[PDB]
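To close the chapter, one final illustration. This time we ask the reader to focus less on the individual chains and more on the assembly as a whole: which components sit near each other, and how the overall shape emerges from the parts.
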Amino acid sequence: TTRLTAEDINGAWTIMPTPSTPDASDWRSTNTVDLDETARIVEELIAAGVNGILSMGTFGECATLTWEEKRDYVSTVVETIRGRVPYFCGTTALNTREVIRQTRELIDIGANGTMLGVPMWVKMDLPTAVQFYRDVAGAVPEAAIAIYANPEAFKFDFPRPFWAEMSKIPQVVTAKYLGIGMLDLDLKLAPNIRFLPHEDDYYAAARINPERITAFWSSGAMCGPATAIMLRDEVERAKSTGDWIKAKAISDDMRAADSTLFPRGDFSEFSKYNIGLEKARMDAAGWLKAGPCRPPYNLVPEDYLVGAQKSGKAWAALHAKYSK
Amino acid sequence: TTRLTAEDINGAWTIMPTPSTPDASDWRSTNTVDLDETARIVEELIAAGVNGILSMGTFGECATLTWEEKRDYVSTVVETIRGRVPYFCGTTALNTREVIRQTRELIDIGANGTMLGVPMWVKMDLPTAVQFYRDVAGAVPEAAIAIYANPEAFKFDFPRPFWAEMSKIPQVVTAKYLGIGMLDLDLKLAPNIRFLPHEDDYYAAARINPERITAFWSSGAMCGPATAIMLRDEVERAKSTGDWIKAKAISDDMRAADSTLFPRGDFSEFSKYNIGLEKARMDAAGWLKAGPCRPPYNLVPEDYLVGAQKSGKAWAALHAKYSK
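The assembled structure is written out below.
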């Protein structure tokens, strides 16, 4: 049974992509994971001071990797991490039995937990979703669980009584969270979960509840982690001094760097191109090579890609600005 | 390369479930396919006079079967069919490479085609969806394809220019179609596809275009196929005589038998419980045993199940009424 709890989740939790070889967009290609780049990214993230590593959500291409590719990737990540930081794989699948099979194998390789959405061919209702997480936690009690709360991908909306239920499952220690409109209530309903806001929302959420909101998730770190590290460090200081001016400046900079990412500012259009826009942004920032998208999600309108590439450049510029 | 064309698709095409053993709702269970019942259903469908067999869509539990279970099921279906009627498996998956792998293997076992939706973790756009079907058809040209046009399950809406594109792919010979509001236009845009309306819509669609609308899909046949056979036979006669009165009576009977199926008459609520409501309806009609639902989709509100069970009884009553 897992000994991870919410108390162990603090600071900057960075979601890394699954690096692609140049042929990864071709359906004829198998073994499209660049394992040299995977290991290099892991070493640089740990050296930059990240607190934890997440992987294999939507832009991590959980949907489009082969099972053999997933095993190779996680083996390399675990081997390179060498237990220095906690690591969550991603085992979202179309049904409960395949999630359980994948979670057992990846935890055995050495992952500490799974970032887990819900099966989505058929939209789930509340008791079905609760039972799904209870089944997985009871079948694989050694795995910690991060709720992957993505309503666009998974159809289910992750409502208030769902969070109350998750808090009663010991394995559920954290969540890649929604917007923060109901964060105040969800914190009260779910005392045992470290809710991770998106990095851009971390400033506001940490001011709402500085006791509970001690960590955030970041994909911008894949463009250069110094900005997220600085946000973490400055928010820590602001909680003591009451001086949030510099934390506010970093956070406002991050929102500006993200302003061109969503096509026409539309979040539902971003969700349709989530994979290619995130990977294109990372490629443009030049801090790592994310590489091409595996099929079918390998076609993005060129003007949408320009917005993502400009975002990558803005984030790379922030990495330079906040390097220390 | 496949020699099936739309000209080979006529009459009553019945979608069969994947029969479950009694323990199928338990995530601990593997090998939950009742292969004795699978073979029995195939023999009775062929003896009743069905023209073709579809399988492994949503209520066929394509999402929740294991790969080993799928292979066993298709092997038994193919072995029992013995080439007497065409047979489409279902190979919808989360990505293009896994669809191609599954389609190659099931066609090699002996299926003539695949009933194929689109990957749905990320909502697809039009050029991505078109390229997905083109990739699969080119990778497995020996497989005929039935478009599984289910917007609730697959998010993509299957719009007019999509049908124009599908008609230019030789392997795409048929479609489990939408409502018929745009059927007139889609027939004009897609000359090479046999569009299958739902059995309840077949009367209206066959009157719109009796040259093109010669076949329909049915799940009500799993409650007793004599009603669908009678609809097929009577519509054929009506196209010659101009006397649609008896075809109208059968069709109105079928709509009445379906009236309690959707919870509160709400189609989006039906879609959330599509699997359990269809299988519960079949169990209640007593013509075959569909058995329990594989996880996670094994919890249905009890009042919703009553509506499905009453529908199963009404369909069983129609089977008796139209037996000959």
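Residues 302-321 of chain A form the longest helix (20 residues). The interface with chain B takes residues 27-28, 30, 58, 62-66, 92-98, 100, 118-125, 127-129, 131-132, 135, 139, 152-153, 271-275, 294-299 of chain A (CB under 8 Å). With these observations in hand, you are ready for the problems at the end of the chapter.
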